[PDB]
């Protein structure tokens, strides 16, 4: 043994593959990478990037949530994603564009918003 390297030569898992789940919400966007069985490995957000409701709800805040979430899972040795998205928010493709641009390989993008057979009475915003 020599003295150790200046930047790591090695990484403790190499599971290769996962799913980026995005909840692009009406006030925010939340990005979490999870292993293929849905146990979450790391996450990051719009709102934690110095933004309130009024700015965290934008595709630009969401774009940054994707980068902090790509960094969140770096040690689990994932690089391959597919993508799942829910919620009315605009964090749905600018997020993905910056997700892929933070060193991951996307292959599929699929919606997982639950839609009803009529269902129950909706929540109200602006008394609508």
């Amino acid at each position: 043994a020599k003295a150790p390297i200046r930047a790591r030569k090695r990484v403790r898992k190499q599971v290769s593959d996962g799913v980026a789940h995005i909840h692009a919400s009406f006030n925010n966007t939340i990005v979490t990478i999870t292993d293929r069985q849905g146990n979450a490995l790391g996450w990051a957000t719009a709102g934690g990037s110095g933004f309130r409701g009024s700015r965290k709800s934008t595709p630009f805040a969401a774009q940054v949530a994707a980068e902090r979430c790509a960094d969140a899972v770096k040690e689990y040795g994932i690089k391959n994603l597919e993508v799942m998205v829910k919620g009315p928010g605009p964090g749905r493709e600018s997020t993905i564009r910056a997700l892929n641009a933070a060193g991951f390989r996307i292959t599929n993008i699929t919606d997982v918003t639950p839609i009803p057979h009529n269902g129950c009475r909706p929540p109200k915003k602006r008394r609508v």
Partner: protein, 74 residues
């Protein structure tokens, strides 16, 4: 000449008078999307009386847990 090439439940009076039935859930699959929605008369290849009758049977099978009703299940 006589006769000409008919359309589904067309050129006759005594077909599709009573409802198009639900037990053929394999045939019903033809008349739903990949999100479990109904397709209208112009898409089932049928006219107004028969589409109303299709849409009752399609409804029936899905709420009987026999036909797809969304892209998702649990």
């Amino acid at each position: 000449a006589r006769y000409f090439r008919r359309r589904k439940f067309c050129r006759f009076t005594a077909e599709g008078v009573q409802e198009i039935d639900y037990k053929d859930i394999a045939t019903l699959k033809n008349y739903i999307t990949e999100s479990g929605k109904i397709v209208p008369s112009r898409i089932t290849g049928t006219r107004a009386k028969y589409q109303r009758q299709l849409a009752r049977a399609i409804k029936r099978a899905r709420y009987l847990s026999l036909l797809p009703y969304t892209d998702r299940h649990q």
